[PDB]
Amino acid sequence: PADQPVHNYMIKRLDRRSLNAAFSIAVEALGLISGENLDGTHISSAMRL
Amino acid sequence: PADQPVHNYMIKRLDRRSLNAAFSIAVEALGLISGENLDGTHISSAMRL
């Protein structure tokens, strides 16, 4: 006896991943970039840069 | 010689062969196909397609 055509159904699922990357800031840069330690001193501008 | 064996016409006879296939269809299909188990709702006119 012959064979009827066959049909197939299949589901598949994802996988979960991430990518981590740390990035730090010193205690003094937090002052300089913020804007508290800057004042009318040409040195402070250089350190800000 | 003037005899019988002058045959140079061996015979070739046909043989019959065939092919088959199976094409089953479900019971709920032809119901909608022939419009027998059908109603005016948008749903039954979608399953028919």
Coordinates of C-alpha atoms in Angstrom, one line a residue:
Chain A
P1 CA 0.0 0.0 0.0
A2 CA 1.3 3.4 -1.0
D3 CA 2.2 6.2 1.4
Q4 CA 0.3 9.4 1.8
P5 CA 2.3 12.7 2.1
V6 CA 3.5 13.5 5.6
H7 CA 3.5 16.8 7.5
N8 CA 5.8 17.9 10.3
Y9 CA 5.5 20.5 13.0
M10 CA 8.3 21.6 15.3
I11 CA 8.8 24.4 17.9
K12 CA 12.1 25.4 19.4
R13 CA 12.9 27.9 22.1
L14 CA 15.4 30.7 22.8
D15 CA 18.4 30.8 25.1
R16 CA 19.2 33.7 27.4
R17 CA 22.6 35.3 27.7
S18 CA 24.1 38.6 28.6
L19 CA 27.4 40.5 28.4
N20 CA 28.9 42.3 31.4
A21 CA 31.5 45.1 31.3
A22 CA 32.6 47.1 34.4
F23 CA 33.6 50.8 34.1
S24 CA 35.0 52.8 37.0
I25 CA 35.7 56.4 37.9
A26 CA 38.2 57.6 40.5
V27 CA 37.2 59.6 43.6
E28 CA 38.7 62.9 42.2
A29 CA 37.3 62.7 38.7
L30 CA 33.9 62.6 40.3
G31 CA 34.7 66.1 41.7
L32 CA 36.3 67.5 38.5
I33 CA 33.6 66.4 36.0
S34 CA 30.8 67.3 38.3
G35 CA 31.8 71.0 38.7
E36 CA 32.4 71.6 42.4
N37 CA 36.2 71.8 42.6
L38 CA 36.5 74.0 39.5
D39 CA 37.2 77.7 40.2
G40 CA 38.8 80.7 38.7
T41 CA 42.2 79.0 38.5
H42 CA 43.8 78.2 35.2
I43 CA 45.2 75.0 36.8
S44 CA 41.7 73.7 37.5
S45 CA 40.8 74.0 33.9
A46 CA 43.8 71.9 32.9
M47 CA 42.8 69.2 35.4
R48 CA 39.2 69.3 34.1
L49 CA 40.5 68.8 30.5
Chain B
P1 CA 18.9 -25.7 -48.3
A2 CA 15.2 -25.6 -49.1
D3 CA 14.0 -26.1 -45.5
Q4 CA 12.0 -24.4 -42.8
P5 CA 14.7 -22.7 -40.6
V6 CA 14.9 -19.3 -42.2
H7 CA 13.7 -17.4 -39.2
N8 CA 15.2 -14.0 -38.4
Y9 CA 12.3 -12.3 -36.8
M10 CA 12.2 -13.1 -33.0
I11 CA 9.1 -11.7 -31.3
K12 CA 8.9 -8.9 -28.7
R13 CA 5.9 -8.7 -26.4
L14 CA 4.6 -5.8 -24.3
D15 CA 4.5 -5.9 -20.5
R16 CA 2.1 -3.9 -18.3
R17 CA 3.2 -1.8 -15.4
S18 CA 1.4 0.7 -13.2
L19 CA 1.9 3.4 -10.4
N20 CA -0.1 4.2 -7.3
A21 CA -0.5 6.9 -4.7
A22 CA -2.5 7.8 -1.6
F23 CA -4.3 11.1 -1.1
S24 CA -6.3 10.9 2.1
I25 CA -8.5 13.9 3.2
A26 CA -10.0 14.4 6.6
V27 CA -13.7 14.4 7.4
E28 CA -13.8 18.0 8.8
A29 CA -12.2 19.2 5.5
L30 CA -14.8 18.2 3.0
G31 CA -17.5 19.4 5.3
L32 CA -16.4 23.0 5.0
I33 CA -15.3 22.4 1.4
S34 CA -18.8 21.4 0.2
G35 CA -20.3 24.1 2.5
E36 CA -22.3 21.5 4.4
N37 CA -21.2 22.2 8.0
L38 CA -20.8 26.0 7.4
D39 CA -22.5 29.1 8.8
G40 CA -22.2 32.8 7.9
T41 CA -19.8 33.8 10.6
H42 CA -16.4 35.2 9.7
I43 CA -14.7 32.3 11.5
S44 CA -16.0 29.4 9.4
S45 CA -15.2 31.4 6.3
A46 CA -11.6 31.6 7.5
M47 CA -11.1 27.9 8.3
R48 CA -12.5 27.1 4.9
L49 CA -9.5 28.9 3.3

